[PDB]
């Protein structure tokens, strides 16, 4: 059996895998679809403030400029999303970016 | 209308918060309890293999040496755990080690 936290991690691995091609990496179209399918309420909050999160997410997160998102780069993206929810849990508005 | 992914992120923020002190940071005993309560399968696998993950997890993740774990240090720990689960999903023995 798995705890909720274990299940969550396991599910994140599945989510990554779902959007990969045979090279175990995610291309730009698939990353954007992953975001719309899995983080629609996050994206709606960005839209509410006039921000298109999807305009530059791929290029910001493709750290090595190889036109693919690997697992490490995917984890950085999940960390950015989690950070936003963490800030909300201390009273911030959603989609606050905030790279000061 | 939160998706499974959104709910999983919210739950990880709630899990972090369960273990924090008033400064919204986690001390060492609490981080070790968090690991035991939330990642027992990962820890069981390390223990089976002869790795005591808890011996230095705190010091490895507490890069600034304030003897607390903030949300970003906690995210780095979750990334380590997720990376292990990702390697496991490709056939690796669990608790395979990072670097990164
Ligand atoms: Ho990449
Ligand atoms: Ho820290």
Swiss-Prot record, chains A, B:
Residues modified as N-acetylserine: 1
InterPro entries: EF-hand-dom_pair, EF_Hand_1_Ca_BS, EF_hand_dom, S-100_dom, S100/CaBP7/8-like_CS, S100_Ca-bd_sub
Pfam families given in the database record: S_100 (PF01023)
Domain of life: Eukaryota
Transmembrane portions of the chain: none
SUPFAM superfamilies linked to this entry: EF-hand
Tissue: Fetal ear, skin, and tongue and human cell lines. Highly up-regulated in psoriatic epidermis. Also highly expressed in the urine of bladder squamous cell carcinoma (SCC) bearing patients.
GO biological process terms held by the UniProt record: angiogenesis; antimicrobial humoral immune response mediated by antimicrobial peptide; endothelial cell migration; epidermis development; keratinocyte differentiation; positive regulation of ERK1 and ERK2 cascade; positive regulation of granulocyte chemotaxis; positive regulation of monocyte chemotaxis
Subunit structure comment from the entry: Interacts with RANBP9.
Descriptive protein name: Protein S100-A7
Origin species: Homo sapiens (Human)
């Amino acid at each position: 059996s798995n705890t909720q936290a274990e299940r969550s991690i396991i599910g994140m691995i599945d989510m990554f895998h779902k959007y990969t091609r045979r090279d175990d990496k995610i291309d730009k179209p698939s990353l954007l679809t992953m975001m719309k399918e899995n983080f629609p309420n996050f994206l709606s909050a960005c839209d509410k403030k006039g921000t298109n999160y999807l305009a530059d997410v791929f290029e910001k997160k493709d750290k090595n400029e190889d036109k693919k998102i690997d697992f490490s780069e995917f984890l950085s993206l999940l960390g950015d999303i989690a950070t936003d929810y963490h800030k909300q849990s201390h009273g911030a508005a959603p989609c606050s970016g905030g790279s000061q």
